Design a protein around this ligand. Sequence first.
Ligand code: SF4
Lengths: 216, 56
Amino acid sequence: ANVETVAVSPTICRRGGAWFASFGRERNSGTKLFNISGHVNNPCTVEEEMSVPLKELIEKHAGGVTGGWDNLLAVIPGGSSTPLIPKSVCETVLMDFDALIQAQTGLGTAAVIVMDRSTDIVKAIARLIEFYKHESCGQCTPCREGVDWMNKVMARFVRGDARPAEIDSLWEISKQIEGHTICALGDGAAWPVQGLIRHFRPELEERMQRFAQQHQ
Amino acid sequence: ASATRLIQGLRNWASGRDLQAKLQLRYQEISKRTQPPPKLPVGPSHRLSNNYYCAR
Ligand code: SF4
């Protein structure tokens, strides 16, 4: 059992029956920590309702996004096992499990962090894949070999050293890793690569175009 | 070719085909050997993210 579930477990018994479900929606309900790190003014952790709008979460408890609300590029909830959310989606979507599944991103644990317009999101996600290469065992051949390919391919996409058939093959391998492992670290290595290919396709195209125009 | 006129005329007269233009000795339209090196194309395979072998 997780420490949040254990720590909430005495107050459920000593306080009212189903009073905990008076916070938010009906299925996914209660209070949750939200941890807002990254490119926000005064990054911190708070307790809030489970159901809460994301813009109110970011602005009204932890400063503001550096340079106004319009300066942010993307927001990853959950942490490293969740695909990203572009700005036009996170203008509306609240912080619930089923709502983020309707936005096709599995909510992890509370790591609602942002990344700025002036930051290489390809570099950040490639370093996140280097994190998964550093911390993963090697029982399964799929996550081992696939995290190997995804790290080498994301390094080549940071340098922009390929052609768009390679980014389609990255989509193919990120389909093939997910759902064929022991644990959820393989699926968690497959999701953010999928979210990057879903949402920030033309920036990868621009990077590879820049490297082609310079190398040629 | 490169023969004189009289035996050319007797070849043309003993067989009326005007034999000089087509005579089956190849002189200049032998294909020039040591051609430039070729790049060979690849057909409907090798396209990434569709080549599941279960399909074909
Ligand atoms: S998928 Fe999980 S259990 Fe399998 S080798 Fe990778 S980290 Fe280990």
